[PDB]
């Protein structure tokens, strides 16, 4: 199989990427099939990650009668690739979302589907409404709407960059601990994404005494992460009021608005009058701690007078800047291409079928590398020129990321 | 010249590489991504001083809207910072990711003398393959020794003739690099800023600041302040300081405090920050003070050349005759976000004018070419498409740059020879 | 794509109107999709504005258990065009109303559709029921009856006028203010609509004293508003009794009877015996307080007596006339062509799907005009004469504003 | 140089003479070609800005601002047509227009000739402009044709007026009507009124102000918003006040700030307005600003409010609440050409004591006043089939043929010889 046949038809089989990265690799093709349950209202959202160089394929949210989503599950791949490999590159990936059949006591089909390929991460999108998804790209090919749910949609992953290094999968390293639930893994680390935040710039705080403390929210921003991340920096406090106790806690909010993790940074911190008081941030959040994708981050601060009753107005001022380092974030395909597929009002008690094939290039771990042979790529000259020509004339040929399924069928029949 | 020929026409990329005022193009490398082309100008009239002499530090490979910095020499030896030259529109207000196709810049004098004799002034220009603080001589005469390549320096060019700085490539197959774009965020501070920085290919400086260095002084009221080190680092953008020093003393009652100074190109302190305050030492134990410093992009106003660490040691109460003493061990790490990216810091072009006559105008005017990705607000309106395909452009560029010495293609040109070269190559 | 193909088939793609209005612009196409939930009785009313130059498509109303209606939502396009553009013209628009509920057996589910296109405004319709729609016109190509929801109806926008200039979209202007909820915009101004209501022509009032005062509704009149308006004029009150005081309030009533906006016009206005007493009117109603469209207006004067006593006489008399300016109201398409689509008794659990596409000619705001190129229109001679030739012979060719969807599909096939 | 036919010729070469616009506006008119000649004294820094209105249907051609020593602008004067057109005509259209900005010459006592020019054509008003700096003007549009950069002042530049829209009715000039009055400085004119521009401003959406007493009261600015005016205004609306403190006094004043930053027109809306507790009380805005009160183009409006109370000590505090919305109506603002295209010529570093030479020709279509209609023949325009189609073809291939709005005088001269 050539490379353009594997790129335009990912269900054919894997081909090596023809480029300058020559390395001993194996070609493996993967599958992932789901019967995910429609919620009570009938509607929800599917967040694909085309381009992700690993086993994570996407997430599932269910829209409810309040109007806010609820996380169902992370859509994964059949084989746990970090359990048996170390490095990875995505050759191609295709998905298909259809609800073409009835449940037991239902005599009619319901449902329509919108789908877009937004060219940024998931927190960058303004409208997540059913109607407002269509205004996320200006391209005719990257979006389609009012598709019947019985026909379905087909997601095709087009290349974001070539000449990419191999990316380290989240694989466990051998380790011994007294904790039985001790996990030590080697994360993805090349090409990170760093968000800087100037939290306060000599911000003055004035709020009178309340017994138990006064809790405020300093800021709230929009980060993006599926994998491990860190937080570093300092906030510097000044005061004139004797005996204050400061507590701060970092929150990492999911896409559905609920709290994923919580981390107390300062516990029982004592101010000093006439001296600047500094608290550090040293957070490392591992990969397993993160269940659903992270859309926001929030710092809230709790202040309390040390035994001052009926008075003691307790002001302070703060200055400082922190940083959030997403490990492996700017690798093209980790976060920056997203595809949202929003089905609306399917019949209750019914299922939505997601099925796909993902073609990889791997390097095995030392337990498997003694049994499995790796070769260099089976070259052929002039495959990269033909690939670049097809990608350059993509508007004329009609090649697109998001199709309806009959168009991908007769395009596949015309291409074969 | 009359600056035109912007984005809309597409150029075969060796004409766009060697003549960036013709217009933009796409790079023939394998980084295949939907993007939009863009061509943008920057026209500056400069302000000379009493001495009439100064320096313009160009970054000809910088991805983004920073193009250069300008320093004016004084009656002493010390420079003074005027402004940073930048492009027409602010690119992080509209886009997220960026590469640099080409760039060309021109430093002339638009004064047009009326008589027989011209007006005063000459120009030295060089291209240095390294950072701004790595230069040993930044004087007017000291530029001509910075490079050994004959096509990368030119001397005693008259200001009425002028100079031309053509940007030749540092590498290819580079990724798109994230602009300093503002995030959507809410907060209590009205001056709350949060951006997403350039982060790919960082640069790290590891500084073993002390290895059992001991201090001793008699007690002076207010404290005794000593400067522990000073290294030459390089930053235009976000910066981070990590590490730890550790102390062991035998004297009771000492109180320690540390402060970080980031010094610009001209000696004047850009940023002062306190990393540790009111640290109390304990006799016979080990005393641990960390560094947790994050610096945003908007606080760097000028390029930074050195970094310091002063330490103020005090004593609680304190008689006039008392001993303060301690030991220090530790090491530090300075992390320049996006330092080792080819073009972010490393190619540096310096153009020194000297003795420009009173009432003369020095003009900087050039065109930069880009490959850009819109933000979520501009992607609702602008169509992004893959680059056009023509084969053999990359081999032809490799051939021309392989025979750059015989053809005589220079990074710094006198403008007459470049105008001749354009008439020849067209 | 030519103009005569983009006018009769707006799903094809946008063209620019061939006329004597030459201006640097950029052409654009927007898609709006809405899955609608049907109320308890099963019926409702969708009111489309088929020629509206901005980005307001329609408004959903639901018929209740009594005769009343209830406002659901304003149907809109995908993106908020005033956020990014200044000026606009509409080229074409096409909308589709059917149920995507796909019955399984032999027979279908419940539900029919009436649809008319009315040449005046919305508060000029005499009867707005299901049966009373199909009387509103006399043209046989502008109304259709008993259309099944499984087949559906299709609304096409044919021109009200050509050679008309652009209209200013309600964009925000740069402004600073102390109040953080400050809105300042530049809205549609050209071709105003002015109403003159002689509210009282020497009316006379007389009543006994009551605590809180006596409230009487002076007039009530049917006006039209989707965007901003203003009210001006005066009332001259003559009285003969000491101690009187007046206070007035203007209500703006929506299409469903509900009071949208109340404004205190004058308050604590004392009357002086034997002279004129002027109560001038100065109201500006911005675009953002109007959530549902305005179809009526009231004035209610609350008279009272200072130093009141039980059983005491109070009386006055008034003259005056008022002006109501609807900004951008006589522009063609803002208010004047209105298509109504009423559905009755759709089965339980079925959704009605409003989905269509609209084509524009747009001019960006100065933040977006620095990155798009705007240019003059394409030259095609004879497109205007061919458009006139098609529209003059419309009945012989059978070109309708409301279609059955199958018959417009047949028209589309033998027009390709 | 040595200043003072079909429609396309008079559109692309406006010094050739007037013509009639071929469209469906069949009206009896006369034809007129006007000139404007200015020698503009450069400022003390040698820098400034020249604003043009290329499509303006009247005698106002532009304005001139001189860049000061502390980075600010200062209003110099207004650029005008040689003949006062409202003095003898009623209605007007603009056929075409051309300008030229140049120095090319020495002040005397100076031995060298320095300076540069950047210029853009901007498709919005002057208050809609983001940067006014010398660098940042070149960013204001994305068209290759509509902008030019780094032009030597001895060469020059040329502003060509390409059409904003056709089938435009005749707009009415600001002409005096016959009137008598007691005040000798009594004026009465009939302004441009077709296609206005409205700005609605929700000033306070339940804003609650509170501050301590000071003698004389405290003064705070409720808003300021960017607007546009060369001709008459109308400010209308309402603000409703609510207080619980007893005995307050209010004061309100509208300012209209120019482009140089100084105040142009000021009007007192409320003087000595006394509040009442538990009662909606209100001040109305009834403002008519004439054309002769406007001396420079207007960029922003603002409202400063002064509160006070009668007989207050140093301790007691005063507070109120405010809701209300007001609307500004710019008469004739959305006529195309009156405010919407702006050409901006920022010259820089011309030697001090020198002049900048503005020369131009503008063609019109006019309808006389009743004093001049007795003596001047008006008739319909000459007919030729296919001039509008050739205009549409020329503007359809504008990017190919290299027709633009602002380009240097030498390329304009080569184009003018290549076309003629």
JSON list of N, CA, C and O in Angstrom, two decimals, chain A residues 173-192:
[
{"chain": "A", "resi": 173, "resn": "UNK", "atom": "N", "xyz": [7.68, 3.01, 33.78]},
{"chain": "A", "resi": 173, "resn": "UNK", "atom": "CA", "xyz": [9.07, 2.63, 33.97]},
{"chain": "A", "resi": 173, "resn": "UNK", "atom": "C", "xyz": [9.12, 1.66, 35.15]},
{"chain": "A", "resi": 173, "resn": "UNK", "atom": "O", "xyz": [8.22, 1.69, 36.00]},
{"chain": "A", "resi": 174, "resn": "UNK", "atom": "N", "xyz": [10.10, 0.75, 35.22]},
{"chain": "A", "resi": 174, "resn": "UNK", "atom": "CA", "xyz": [10.20, -0.12, 36.39]},
{"chain": "A", "resi": 174, "resn": "UNK", "atom": "C", "xyz": [10.60, 0.66, 37.64]},
{"chain": "A", "resi": 174, "resn": "UNK", "atom": "O", "xyz": [11.51, 1.49, 37.60]},
{"chain": "A", "resi": 175, "resn": "UNK", "atom": "N", "xyz": [9.92, 0.38, 38.74]},
{"chain": "A", "resi": 175, "resn": "UNK", "atom": "CA", "xyz": [10.09, 1.15, 39.96]},
{"chain": "A", "resi": 175, "resn": "UNK", "atom": "C", "xyz": [9.59, 0.33, 41.14]},
{"chain": "A", "resi": 175, "resn": "UNK", "atom": "O", "xyz": [8.71, -0.53, 40.99]},
{"chain": "A", "resi": 176, "resn": "UNK", "atom": "N", "xyz": [10.15, 0.61, 42.31]},
{"chain": "A", "resi": 176, "resn": "UNK", "atom": "CA", "xyz": [9.82, -0.07, 43.56]},
{"chain": "A", "resi": 176, "resn": "UNK", "atom": "C", "xyz": [9.40, 0.99, 44.56]},
{"chain": "A", "resi": 176, "resn": "UNK", "atom": "O", "xyz": [10.10, 1.99, 44.73]},
{"chain": "A", "resi": 177, "resn": "UNK", "atom": "N", "xyz": [8.25, 0.78, 45.21]},
{"chain": "A", "resi": 177, "resn": "UNK", "atom": "CA", "xyz": [7.78, 1.71, 46.22]},
{"chain": "A", "resi": 177, "resn": "UNK", "atom": "C", "xyz": [7.12, 0.98, 47.37]},
{"chain": "A", "resi": 177, "resn": "UNK", "atom": "O", "xyz": [6.67, -0.16, 47.23]},
{"chain": "A", "resi": 178, "resn": "UNK", "atom": "N", "xyz": [7.07, 1.66, 48.51]},
{"chain": "A", "resi": 178, "resn": "UNK", "atom": "CA", "xyz": [6.35, 1.11, 49.65]},
{"chain": "A", "resi": 178, "resn": "UNK", "atom": "C", "xyz": [4.85, 1.30, 49.50]},
{"chain": "A", "resi": 178, "resn": "UNK", "atom": "O", "xyz": [4.05, 0.52, 50.03]},
{"chain": "A", "resi": 179, "resn": "UNK", "atom": "N", "xyz": [4.45, 2.35, 48.79]},
{"chain": "A", "resi": 179, "resn": "UNK", "atom": "CA", "xyz": [3.06, 2.52, 48.41]},
{"chain": "A", "resi": 179, "resn": "UNK", "atom": "C", "xyz": [2.69, 1.43, 47.41]},
{"chain": "A", "resi": 179, "resn": "UNK", "atom": "O", "xyz": [3.40, 1.25, 46.41]},
{"chain": "A", "resi": 180, "resn": "UNK", "atom": "N", "xyz": [1.63, 0.65, 47.65]},
{"chain": "A", "resi": 180, "resn": "UNK", "atom": "CA", "xyz": [1.21, -0.31, 46.62]},
{"chain": "A", "resi": 180, "resn": "UNK", "atom": "C", "xyz": [0.63, 0.34, 45.38]},
{"chain": "A", "resi": 180, "resn": "UNK", "atom": "O", "xyz": [0.73, -0.22, 44.28]},
{"chain": "A", "resi": 181, "resn": "UNK", "atom": "N", "xyz": [0.01, 1.51, 45.51]},
{"chain": "A", "resi": 181, "resn": "UNK", "atom": "CA", "xyz": [-0.50, 2.26, 44.36]},
{"chain": "A", "resi": 181, "resn": "UNK", "atom": "C", "xyz": [0.51, 3.31, 43.89]},
{"chain": "A", "resi": 181, "resn": "UNK", "atom": "O", "xyz": [0.20, 4.48, 43.66]},
{"chain": "A", "resi": 182, "resn": "UNK", "atom": "N", "xyz": [1.74, 2.85, 43.69]},
{"chain": "A", "resi": 182, "resn": "UNK", "atom": "CA", "xyz": [2.84, 3.69, 43.23]},
{"chain": "A", "resi": 182, "resn": "UNK", "atom": "C", "xyz": [2.98, 3.52, 41.73]},
{"chain": "A", "resi": 182, "resn": "UNK", "atom": "O", "xyz": [3.22, 2.40, 41.25]},
{"chain": "A", "resi": 183, "resn": "UNK", "atom": "N", "xyz": [2.82, 4.61, 40.99]},
{"chain": "A", "resi": 183, "resn": "UNK", "atom": "CA", "xyz": [2.94, 4.61, 39.54]},
{"chain": "A", "resi": 183, "resn": "UNK", "atom": "C", "xyz": [4.02, 5.61, 39.16]},
{"chain": "A", "resi": 183, "resn": "UNK", "atom": "O", "xyz": [4.07, 6.73, 39.69]},
{"chain": "A", "resi": 184, "resn": "UNK", "atom": "N", "xyz": [4.94, 5.19, 38.29]},
{"chain": "A", "resi": 184, "resn": "UNK", "atom": "CA", "xyz": [5.99, 6.05, 37.77]},
{"chain": "A", "resi": 184, "resn": "UNK", "atom": "C", "xyz": [6.04, 5.85, 36.26]},
{"chain": "A", "resi": 184, "resn": "UNK", "atom": "O", "xyz": [6.35, 4.75, 35.80]},
{"chain": "A", "resi": 185, "resn": "UNK", "atom": "N", "xyz": [5.71, 6.89, 35.50]},
{"chain": "A", "resi": 185, "resn": "UNK", "atom": "CA", "xyz": [5.66, 6.79, 34.05]},
{"chain": "A", "resi": 185, "resn": "UNK", "atom": "C", "xyz": [6.54, 7.85, 33.40]},
{"chain": "A", "resi": 185, "resn": "UNK", "atom": "O", "xyz": [6.87, 8.87, 34.01]},
{"chain": "A", "resi": 186, "resn": "UNK", "atom": "N", "xyz": [6.90, 7.60, 32.15]},
{"chain": "A", "resi": 186, "resn": "UNK", "atom": "CA", "xyz": [7.67, 8.55, 31.34]},
{"chain": "A", "resi": 186, "resn": "UNK", "atom": "C", "xyz": [6.72, 9.28, 30.40]},
{"chain": "A", "resi": 186, "resn": "UNK", "atom": "O", "xyz": [6.25, 8.71, 29.42]},
{"chain": "A", "resi": 187, "resn": "UNK", "atom": "N", "xyz": [6.46, 10.55, 30.69]},
{"chain": "A", "resi": 187, "resn": "UNK", "atom": "CA", "xyz": [5.45, 11.31, 29.98]},
{"chain": "A", "resi": 187, "resn": "UNK", "atom": "C", "xyz": [5.96, 11.74, 28.60]},
{"chain": "A", "resi": 187, "resn": "UNK", "atom": "O", "xyz": [7.13, 11.59, 28.25]},
{"chain": "A", "resi": 188, "resn": "UNK", "atom": "N", "xyz": [5.03, 12.29, 27.81]},
{"chain": "A", "resi": 188, "resn": "UNK", "atom": "CA", "xyz": [5.36, 13.01, 26.59]},
{"chain": "A", "resi": 188, "resn": "UNK", "atom": "C", "xyz": [5.88, 14.40, 26.96]},
{"chain": "A", "resi": 188, "resn": "UNK", "atom": "O", "xyz": [5.23, 15.12, 27.72]},
{"chain": "A", "resi": 189, "resn": "UNK", "atom": "N", "xyz": [7.04, 14.76, 26.42]},
{"chain": "A", "resi": 189, "resn": "UNK", "atom": "CA", "xyz": [7.75, 15.94, 26.90]},
{"chain": "A", "resi": 189, "resn": "UNK", "atom": "C", "xyz": [8.28, 16.86, 25.82]},
{"chain": "A", "resi": 189, "resn": "UNK", "atom": "O", "xyz": [8.53, 18.04, 26.12]},
{"chain": "A", "resi": 190, "resn": "UNK", "atom": "N", "xyz": [8.48, 16.39, 24.60]},
{"chain": "A", "resi": 190, "resn": "UNK", "atom": "CA", "xyz": [9.03, 17.24, 23.56]},
{"chain": "A", "resi": 190, "resn": "UNK", "atom": "C", "xyz": [7.98, 18.23, 23.10]},
{"chain": "A", "resi": 190, "resn": "UNK", "atom": "O", "xyz": [6.79, 17.90, 23.00]},
{"chain": "A", "resi": 191, "resn": "UNK", "atom": "N", "xyz": [8.42, 19.46, 22.83]},
{"chain": "A", "resi": 191, "resn": "UNK", "atom": "CA", "xyz": [7.66, 20.58, 22.30]},
{"chain": "A", "resi": 191, "resn": "UNK", "atom": "C", "xyz": [6.50, 20.97, 23.21]},
{"chain": "A", "resi": 191, "resn": "UNK", "atom": "O", "xyz": [5.34, 20.67, 22.91]},
{"chain": "A", "resi": 192, "resn": "UNK", "atom": "N", "xyz": [6.76, 21.60, 24.36]},
{"chain": "A", "resi": 192, "resn": "UNK", "atom": "CA", "xyz": [5.68, 21.88, 25.31]},
{"chain": "A", "resi": 192, "resn": "UNK", "atom": "C", "xyz": [4.93, 23.16, 25.00]},
{"chain": "A", "resi": 192, "resn": "UNK", "atom": "O", "xyz": [5.25, 23.90, 24.08]}
]
